[PDB]
Design a protein around this ligand. Structure first.
Ligand code: MG
Ligand code: MG
Ligand code: MG
Ligand code: MG
Ligand code: MG
Ligand code: MG
Ligand code: MG
Ligand code: MG
Ligand code: MG
Ligand code: MG
Ligand code: MG
Ligand code: MG
Ligand code: MG
Ligand code: MG
Ligand code: MG
Ligand code: MG
Ligand code: MG
Ligand code: MG
Ligand code: MG
Ligand code: MG
Ligand code: MG
Ligand code: MG
Ligand code: MG
Ligand code: MG
Ligand code: MG
Ligand code: MG
Ligand code: MG
Ligand code: MG
Ligand code: MG
Ligand code: MG
Ligand code: MG
Ligand code: MG
Ligand code: MG
Ligand code: MG
Ligand code: MG
Ligand code: MG
Ligand code: MG
Ligand code: MG
Ligand code: MG
Ligand code: MG
Ligand code: MG
Ligand code: MG
Ligand code: MG
Ligand code: MG
Ligand code: MG
Ligand code: MG
Ligand code: MG
Ligand code: MG
Ligand code: MG
Ligand code: MG
Ligand code: MG
Ligand code: MG
Ligand code: MG
Ligand code: MG
Ligand code: MG
Ligand code: MG
Ligand code: MG
Ligand code: MG
Ligand code: MG
Ligand code: MG
Ligand code: MG
Ligand code: MG
Ligand code: MG
Ligand code: MG
Ligand code: MG
Ligand code: MG
Ligand code: MG
Ligand code: MG
Ligand code: MG
Ligand code: MG
Ligand code: MG
Ligand code: MG
Ligand code: MG
Ligand code: MG
Ligand code: MG
Ligand code: MG
Ligand code: MG
Ligand code: MG
Ligand code: MG
Ligand code: MG
Ligand code: MG
Ligand code: MG
Ligand code: MG
Ligand code: MG
Ligand code: MG
Ligand code: MG
Ligand code: MG
Ligand code: MG
Ligand code: MG
Ligand code: MG
Ligand code: MG
Ligand code: MG
Ligand code: MG
Ligand code: MG
Ligand code: MG
Ligand code: MG
Ligand code: MG
Ligand code: MG
Ligand code: MG
Ligand code: MG
Ligand code: MG
Ligand code: MG
Ligand code: MG
Ligand code: MG
Ligand code: MG
Ligand code: MG
Ligand code: MG
Ligand code: MG
Ligand code: MG
Ligand code: MG
Ligand code: MG
Ligand code: MG
Ligand code: MG
Ligand code: MG
Ligand code: MG
Ligand code: MG
Ligand code: MG
Ligand code: MG
Ligand code: MG
Ligand code: MG
Ligand code: MG
Ligand code: MG
Ligand code: MG
Ligand code: MG
Ligand code: MG
Ligand code: MG
Ligand code: MG
Ligand code: MG
Ligand code: MG
Ligand code: MG
Ligand code: MG
Ligand code: MG
Ligand code: MG
Ligand code: MG
Ligand code: MG
Ligand code: MG
Ligand code: MG
Ligand code: MG
Ligand code: MG
Ligand code: MG
Ligand code: MG
Ligand code: MG
Ligand code: MG
Ligand code: MG
Ligand code: MG
Ligand code: MG
Ligand code: MG
Ligand code: MG
Ligand code: MG
Ligand code: MG
Ligand code: MG
Ligand code: MG
Ligand code: MG
Ligand code: MG
Ligand code: MG
Ligand code: MG
Ligand code: MG
Ligand code: MG
Ligand code: MG
Ligand code: MG
Ligand code: MG
Ligand code: MG
Ligand code: MG
Ligand code: MG
Ligand code: MG
Ligand code: MG
Ligand code: MG
Ligand code: MG
Ligand code: MG
Ligand code: MG
Ligand code: MG
Ligand code: MG
Ligand code: MG
Ligand code: MG
Ligand code: MG
Ligand code: MG
Ligand code: MG
Ligand code: MG
Ligand code: MG
Ligand code: MG
Ligand code: MG
Ligand code: MG
Ligand code: MG
Ligand code: MG
Ligand code: MG
Ligand code: MG
Ligand code: MG
Ligand code: MG
Ligand code: MG
Ligand code: MG
Ligand code: MG
Ligand code: MG
Ligand code: MG
Ligand code: MG
Ligand code: MG
Ligand code: MG
Ligand code: MG
Ligand code: MG
Ligand code: MG
Ligand code: MG
Ligand code: MG
Ligand code: MG
Ligand code: MG
Ligand code: MG
Ligand code: MG
Ligand code: MG
Ligand code: MG
Ligand code: MG
Lengths: 47, 272
RNA sequence: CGAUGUCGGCUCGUCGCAUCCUGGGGCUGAAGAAGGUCCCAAGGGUUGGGCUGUUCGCCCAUUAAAGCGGCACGCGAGCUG
RNA sequence: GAAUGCCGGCAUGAGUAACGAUAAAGAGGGUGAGAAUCCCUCUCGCCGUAAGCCCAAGGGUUCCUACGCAAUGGUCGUCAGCGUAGGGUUAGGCGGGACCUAAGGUGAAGCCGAAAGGCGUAGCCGAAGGGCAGCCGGUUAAUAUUCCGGCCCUUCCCGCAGGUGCGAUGGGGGGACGCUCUAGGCUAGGGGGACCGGAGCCAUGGACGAGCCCGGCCAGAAGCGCAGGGUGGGAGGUAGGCAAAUCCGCCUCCCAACAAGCUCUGCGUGGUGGGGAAGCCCGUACGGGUGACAACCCCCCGAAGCCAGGGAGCCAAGAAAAGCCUCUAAGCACAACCUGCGGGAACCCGUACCGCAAACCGACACAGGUGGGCGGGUGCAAGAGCACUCAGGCGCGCGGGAGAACCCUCGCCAAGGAACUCUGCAAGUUGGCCCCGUAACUUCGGGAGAAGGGGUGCUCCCUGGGGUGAUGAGCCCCGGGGAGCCGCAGUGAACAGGCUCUGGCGACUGUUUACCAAAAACACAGCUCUCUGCGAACUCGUAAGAGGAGGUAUAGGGAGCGACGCUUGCCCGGUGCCGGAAGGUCAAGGGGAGGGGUGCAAGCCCCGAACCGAAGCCCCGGUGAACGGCGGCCGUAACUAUAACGGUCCUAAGGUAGCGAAAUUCCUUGUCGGGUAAGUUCCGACCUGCACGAAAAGCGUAACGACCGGAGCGCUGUCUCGGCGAGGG
RNA sequence: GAGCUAGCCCUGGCCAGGGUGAAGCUGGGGUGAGACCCAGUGGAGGCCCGAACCGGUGGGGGAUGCAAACCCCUCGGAUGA
RNA sequence: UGGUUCGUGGAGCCAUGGGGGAAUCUGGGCGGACCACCGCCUAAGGCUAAGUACUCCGGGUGACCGAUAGCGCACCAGUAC
RNA sequence: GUAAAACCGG
RNA sequence: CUUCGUUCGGGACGAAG
RNA sequence: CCGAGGGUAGGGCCCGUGACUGGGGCGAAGUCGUAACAAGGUAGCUGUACCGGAAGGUGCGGCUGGA
RNA sequence: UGGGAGAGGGUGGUGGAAUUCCCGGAGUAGCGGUGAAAUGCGCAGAUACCGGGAGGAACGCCGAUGGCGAAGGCAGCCACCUGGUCCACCCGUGACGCUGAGGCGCGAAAGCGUGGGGAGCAAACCGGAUUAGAUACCCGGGUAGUCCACGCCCUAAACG
């Protein structure tokens, strides 16, 4: 049948991308933890 | 003069459509139309705030003259009578002798090719707009302003009419289509005659889908629900309602008034 | 109760006898025929349907007879549901 | 030494199940150390509205080539979508951006919120939408509407040449639109051909013949030709389009009523450019040459595509902004704008490859899922159905044998046909088209494909309509009649209803528990009650604000019933709601009688009674399509029986109409009647209604239903009662 | 977290092929004028049959599956909610 | 109403949202309801090191661990997945 | 302009 | 339930039980 | 070819019958009320609608077969 | 040709009396009702009185032994539209006439459907009296209906 992951590159960066974190105060605090964790990608990497 | 159908379906057996016989002109005036925001019942937070709405035919808004004191003394010719999808009534083209074109909401026994004019001067004949202090007592009238210079906000559905019952100082006393007796200021404009398309009452939609074409989604009874959702929900095999009958939000729906009691409007109001 | 799947039907049997029939016999209010009752006897057999989920039961048409019970009210790592 | 302990390693099942659609394989020759599995050839099978092409999304090097086989591949592998390396993606015209707006997001002004932040007009962002200028071939191992060839175009910028008052984000026009059905003329596409051009072939009994087989095109500027869309032309007056207009709108006389005329497309022809099969000969896995100076002609079918903003009907009444045209404003009128020509400039990103799938989404080379376009031919009435097959792509990445039980998927059967069983569950009967003929009932539409029948192939002859062609041959689509032939059988294969009678519930189409329930449940038009006069009620939110609604009592919200027919009886005692400026009760507050604590006292500080004190409650009324409720015991009629009648207790009132062993009935398989040989079911009745009953509606109702029950007809492996054969294990 | 799913807003697209033959018009019949009745044209409908598409009715297989919802036969809708 | 040990308690003190609303040394607060006496302070403006907390970092030390331990990571680890 | 009802007899 | 009273008689009504 | 007739399927009319049920008529002298005939004790009658154990009553309009 | 009478029919408008209800003033211990009472209404300020306002229905006097119409039926007034009928003149057509099976149209009241409206009356319903009992007569409330527009129903002591 039709499964959960139906990918869309416009969708992925307008939801999980860097400009969408830096609107919400809850999403700037996402990147602050991922600075502090050490993460090689802060954000889901889209072309 | 309401058209019925032969029963060549189940749903054509009861369906009536209107006669559309006063309609002269079948596509609207392009400078007087502008697009309609469909909403779904959804507000600026995007939450449903009126249930069971959405789905309709696409509509373009018709801009309606609801003042008529823009153009005191400037007469106009009734050019056409048109369908509006955005009200129960019909609308009328006025070609003013300026050459504005405006829509007025179309009264009953207005015919095409007709002088109308707004003013005090403004003789008492159907389509003409006056202050309520200058219309005679006892005449039927519509498009009534409530407070003056604010807009026609009374008696403008199809068939409806207010009737002038008295004067009292600056204020005049109106018999509303609700039956309310009501003190309205005499400087409020008002357009004479009843409205019509008065066979809008006698329309039978025939089927479920003609509700869906007007954007009326299915309406769920709270007896058919669960007690999370409704007071009336629950109960193994069709409860009779449990309780004094009630909204989804808890207030009672048989009899309970909610005119707010200290309204400042309540001393211009005489009846129901 | 860190699980022993429950009624009924189908399939598959097997066992007990306090025996439904067939076999042997005593008594009879056993003339004969057919019966009644009791004793010995399990070797074999103990039909097909209508109703109802039925077990059971009531009928229909036969029969020599249309037996009663046990095996987790036998049998769902065999089936149905 | 245990905690169904945590982590790691290795055993059991066990060389067991399985090796992923039953579309199918066989041989000869190569390479190789190693071939069922890699390459080539021949034969066979499968798809072919795809299992074949072209795009979008997604993926991201998988594309091509060279060298390889440790792991991946459900076996092998010399192969690969795998390992190493190299190469490969070329745009003014294709998509996107230096264009525009939609929902929505953002947001100067402004509003709101303890903070974080929430709104919000203009504006901005925002696209498979609107706008905008490239078609056909050829080359690469891998790119092309991108490179090349030919032929057309688009912007700017600078110059001359010729014209006019030029001139904006500002005004107007336009862009600009629904659903269904459709006429005219084309095109894509397809069929046929005695006509044209081709290597070749007479096979096996006949044929050297209008024989067989293959192919008879594409694009293409100006100009024409054929269809078709948009559109009136002048004159005055003008207060409207938030300044100004010669523009637009409005008013009033004249000229056509017309595409006559202007443009604007589409389609033919068009200077010219290109392509060109089958067979044969070869050297690759891919291709090349020849056939060729290739021919490139004529009829017919014909689009859902094109002219396109066509036409008609209908109600549910069908985006915006920019590009474009026109008009003026300041400013400018040595400027500027327009037309033609010449020269010059034309950026950024993508382009390989898979793309119904082994490269996307499902942990897998996973029988699942994924939007758009093309989708040939013949026959069956049609069709994108079904069967076969062009082009093209495949035999699904374990095989070889055997011929047991047993399972799956089939095929057939004597006699009986439901006796099987919870139930004809399952499977069989029926089945397309043409023509007869068709009941109760009905809301007059239906029921209807009722039911039940007859025909269906082929050959010969006569004959009636159309369409394209001149009214004609031909070619295409429809019929009628007569005569005859063959077979068990003529929709001879494939695709293609079993029917009828009768109840229950729900009017109906529809919706629902993704993943055990599709229903009598939900919804539904329609009925009623109730609220709401607009800054409405109601809803979301602290608020701002927003929906409602740019709606206005024929409207909006809430609740119940659920088309339709006939109807919806009594009780307001308690609860709810509605109406009452009397009265009782009631908090803060006002009020101070009087009393208290300290002072030597003026004073300071405390309690604190009458009385005035709102809503609400008590109280008084009304209201059932508001919450709800709607009896018991005795006696009595010319035989028992029964009780129309009467008496009596209680309640607020004591179930009316209509139905009733019911989807309601315990005793119950109630008692009769009908179907049956036999009927705990079913149908029709009686009423003794444990425990029906009127909008949690009552009783019926045509049509409808993958709902639930009963019965009969047809037909059958369901069964008596099994048997045999087939393929996948 | 609304890339699954539920609803709504904006913008596009899709639904082969057959039947049934509403209203309305045209001619005739009729009337004082009508209502009305015949044909013919017409092409309506939460109409009918049936592919794409959307579903999931009954049965069988599947059950360490091809699949953590599948496959075969069958069936419902298929111009509309 | 909050804070302080103070949960309405005899409830003061310090801040405050709402209402009323003074004075400038003979002025005002406090000493736990209140009053008298006796005393202590000078509100309605602001700034002010040090002594105090922490360890991203650098160093020293350890009756701290020794690759299932020690930080999740001794090894290109917030990585593969 | 009117005037409370007051049954029955094989 | 009973006796009386009104009535032509019964039923109703009236009075004593 | 037609064809007496036999068979299959579906309609129409008529007769007998049927659990149960509606009302009709006559009976033995039964039970309950008093509807109508006299102003029958509310004048009577009638069309219609509703209600009531039942005669009947009421509402609307009509009649003189009454004042 | 020329006049006349009439509640003859349809449409639009319009005048007053009265009932009920709302508001204001004033005013009290009762009002309605019956054969008598009672339900009911009323110190929460009724009936009766005055003034203002709303709404619906029927049109007093004229008015009868009257008129009109085919019948049912028709009654304030005004205007429009319109049928029928009578008289006078004897002018024209010139037997054109009478009746009428079917058909067609009209057809009181009640009743039905759709919407409107609803002051008074009032089936059904609720009480209070009467009675032996009252599903009646009497009284107090009261829903359809009565009114309008459209479409039905087709009846009667539709009788002279
Ligand atoms: Mg928004
Ligand atoms: Mg939001
Ligand atoms: Mg509903
Ligand atoms: Mg539920
Ligand atoms: Mg919830
Ligand atoms: Mg609740
Ligand atoms: Mg229940
Ligand atoms: Mg209950
Ligand atoms: Mg409840
Ligand atoms: Mg247990
Ligand atoms: Mg265990
Ligand atoms: Mg176990
Ligand atoms: Mg023994
Ligand atoms: Mg014996
Ligand atoms: Mg013996
Ligand atoms: Mg003997
Ligand atoms: Mg013996
Ligand atoms: Mg034995
Ligand atoms: Mg034995
Ligand atoms: Mg049977
Ligand atoms: Mg059975
Ligand atoms: Mg048992
Ligand atoms: Mg046994
Ligand atoms: Mg036991
Ligand atoms: Mg057992
Ligand atoms: Mg089992
Ligand atoms: Mg079992
Ligand atoms: Mg076991
Ligand atoms: Mg089952
Ligand atoms: Mg079960
Ligand atoms: Mg231990
Ligand atoms: Mg362990
Ligand atoms: Mg382990
Ligand atoms: Mg092993
Ligand atoms: Mg082996
Ligand atoms: Mg084993
Ligand atoms: Mg084995
Ligand atoms: Mg195996
Ligand atoms: Mg495989
Ligand atoms: Mg070799
Ligand atoms: Mg094939
Ligand atoms: Mg891509
Ligand atoms: Mg991948
Ligand atoms: Mg790679
Ligand atoms: Mg190689
Ligand atoms: Mg390998
Ligand atoms: Mg391998
Ligand atoms: Mg090799
Ligand atoms: Mg490759
Ligand atoms: Mg490679
Ligand atoms: Mg630029
Ligand atoms: Mg831009
Ligand atoms: Mg923009
Ligand atoms: Mg801020
Ligand atoms: Mg915002
Ligand atoms: Mg905005
Ligand atoms: Mg586009
Ligand atoms: Mg382009
Ligand atoms: Mg390629
Ligand atoms: Mg090309
Ligand atoms: Mg080029
Ligand atoms: Mg200009
Ligand atoms: Mg513009
Ligand atoms: Mg415009
Ligand atoms: Mg072509
Ligand atoms: Mg062609
Ligand atoms: Mg040739
Ligand atoms: Mg030969
Ligand atoms: Mg050809
Ligand atoms: Mg003009
Ligand atoms: Mg101007
Ligand atoms: Mg023309
Ligand atoms: Mg050409
Ligand atoms: Mg040309
Ligand atoms: Mg060639
Ligand atoms: Mg058109
Ligand atoms: Mg526009
Ligand atoms: Mg713009
Ligand atoms: Mg311009
Ligand atoms: Mg740049
Ligand atoms: Mg490319
Ligand atoms: Mg490509
Ligand atoms: Mg595709
Ligand atoms: Mg796949
Ligand atoms: Mg995959
Ligand atoms: Mg993969
Ligand atoms: Mg999976
Ligand atoms: Mg993943
Ligand atoms: Mg694999
Ligand atoms: Mg594979
Ligand atoms: Mg698909
Ligand atoms: Mg085709
Ligand atoms: Mg085809
Ligand atoms: Mg064909
Ligand atoms: Mg054929
Ligand atoms: Mg066909
Ligand atoms: Mg096609
Ligand atoms: Mg096919
Ligand atoms: Mg091939
Ligand atoms: Mg057989
Ligand atoms: Mg046979
Ligand atoms: Mg048979
Ligand atoms: Mg049976
Ligand atoms: Mg049996
Ligand atoms: Mg059955
Ligand atoms: Mg079946
Ligand atoms: Mg067959
Ligand atoms: Mg039928
Ligand atoms: Mg028919
Ligand atoms: Mg048939
Ligand atoms: Mg043949
Ligand atoms: Mg022709
Ligand atoms: Mg043609
Ligand atoms: Mg034959
Ligand atoms: Mg078939
Ligand atoms: Mg049935
Ligand atoms: Mg039943
Ligand atoms: Mg249904
Ligand atoms: Mg489910
Ligand atoms: Mg699930
Ligand atoms: Mg279903
Ligand atoms: Mg299901
Ligand atoms: Mg209804
Ligand atoms: Mg709120
Ligand atoms: Mg709005
Ligand atoms: Mg608003
Ligand atoms: Mg409403
Ligand atoms: Mg509503
Ligand atoms: Mg319901
Ligand atoms: Mg009721
Ligand atoms: Mg009550
Ligand atoms: Mg009450
Ligand atoms: Mg009460
Ligand atoms: Mg109240
Ligand atoms: Mg106080
Ligand atoms: Mg106090
Ligand atoms: Mg005080
Ligand atoms: Mg109070
Ligand atoms: Mg007796
Ligand atoms: Mg009684
Ligand atoms: Mg009753
Ligand atoms: Mg029964
Ligand atoms: Mg029986
Ligand atoms: Mg029987
Ligand atoms: Mg029954
Ligand atoms: Mg019964
Ligand atoms: Mg019951
Ligand atoms: Mg019930
Ligand atoms: Mg009940
Ligand atoms: Mg009810
Ligand atoms: Mg119901
Ligand atoms: Mg029923
Ligand atoms: Mg029903
Ligand atoms: Mg009916
Ligand atoms: Mg029915
Ligand atoms: Mg169904
Ligand atoms: Mg359905
Ligand atoms: Mg078998
Ligand atoms: Mg076998
Ligand atoms: Mg075999
Ligand atoms: Mg086999
Ligand atoms: Mg979604
Ligand atoms: Mg069609
Ligand atoms: Mg017709
Ligand atoms: Mg059609
Ligand atoms: Mg349909
Ligand atoms: Mg259907
Ligand atoms: Mg398609
Ligand atoms: Mg799908
Ligand atoms: Mg579903
Ligand atoms: Mg299924
Ligand atoms: Mg299954
Ligand atoms: Mg079907
Ligand atoms: Mg269908
Ligand atoms: Mg505290
Ligand atoms: Mg405190
Ligand atoms: Mg304290
Ligand atoms: Mg405490
Ligand atoms: Mg304060
Ligand atoms: Mg303060
Ligand atoms: Mg001083
Ligand atoms: Mg203090
Ligand atoms: Mg102190
Ligand atoms: Mg103190
Ligand atoms: Mg102290
Ligand atoms: Mg101090
Ligand atoms: Mg200071
Ligand atoms: Mg500190
Ligand atoms: Mg350190
Ligand atoms: Mg170690
Ligand atoms: Mg470690
Ligand atoms: Mg009496
Ligand atoms: Mg009979
Ligand atoms: Mg008697
Ligand atoms: Mg009498
Ligand atoms: Mg009488
Ligand atoms: Mg009488
Ligand atoms: Mg009565
Ligand atoms: Mg009368
Ligand atoms: Mg004469
Ligand atoms: Mg009548
Ligand atoms: Mg009437
Ligand atoms: Mg009526
Ligand atoms: Mg209605
Ligand atoms: Mg009254
Ligand atoms: Mg008594
Ligand atoms: Mg009365
Ligand atoms: Mg008379």
């Amino acid at each position: 049948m039709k499964r959960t992951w139906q990918p869309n590159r416009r969708k992925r960066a307008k939801t999980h991308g860097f400009r969408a974190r830096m609107r919400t105060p809850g999403g700037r605090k996402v990147l602050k933890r991922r600075r502090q964790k050490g993460r090689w990608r802060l954000t889901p990497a889209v072309r | 003069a309401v058209k019925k159908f032969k029963p060549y379906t189940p749903s054509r057996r009861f369906m009536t459509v209107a006669d559309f016989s006063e309609i002269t002109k079948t596509e609207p005036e392009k400078s007087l139309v502008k697009p309609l925001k469909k909403t779904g019942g959804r507000n600026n937070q995007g939450r449903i705030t009126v249930r069971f709405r959405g789905g309709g035919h696409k509509r373009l808004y018709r801009i309606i003259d609801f003042k008529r004191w823009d153009k005191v003394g400037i007469p106009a010719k009734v050019a056409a009578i048109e369908y509006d999808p955005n009200r129960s009534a019909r609308i009328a083209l006025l070609h003013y002798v300026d050459g504005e074109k405006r829509y007025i909401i179309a009264p009953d026994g207005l015919q095409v090719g007709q002088q109308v004019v707004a003013g005090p001067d403004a003789p008492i004949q159907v389509g003409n707009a006056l202050p309520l202090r200058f219309i005679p007592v006892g005449t039927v009238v519509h498009a009534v302003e409530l407070e003056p210079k604010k807009g026609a906000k009374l008696a403008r559905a199809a068939g409806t009419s207010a009737q002038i019952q008295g004067r009292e100082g600056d204020y005049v006393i109106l018999r509303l289509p609700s039956g309310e007796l009501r003190k309205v200021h005499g400087e409020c404009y008002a357009t004479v005659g009843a409205v019509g398309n008065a066979d809008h009452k006698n329309i039978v939609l025939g089927k479920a889908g003609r509700s869906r074409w007007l954007g009326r989604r299915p309406h769920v009874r709270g007896a058919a629900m669960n007690p999370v959702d409704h007071p009336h929900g629950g109960g193994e095999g069709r409860a009779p309602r449990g309780r004094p009958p009630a909204s989804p939000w808890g207030w009672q729906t048989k009899g309970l008034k909610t005119r707010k009691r200290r309204k400042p409007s309540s001393r211009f109001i005489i009846a129901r």
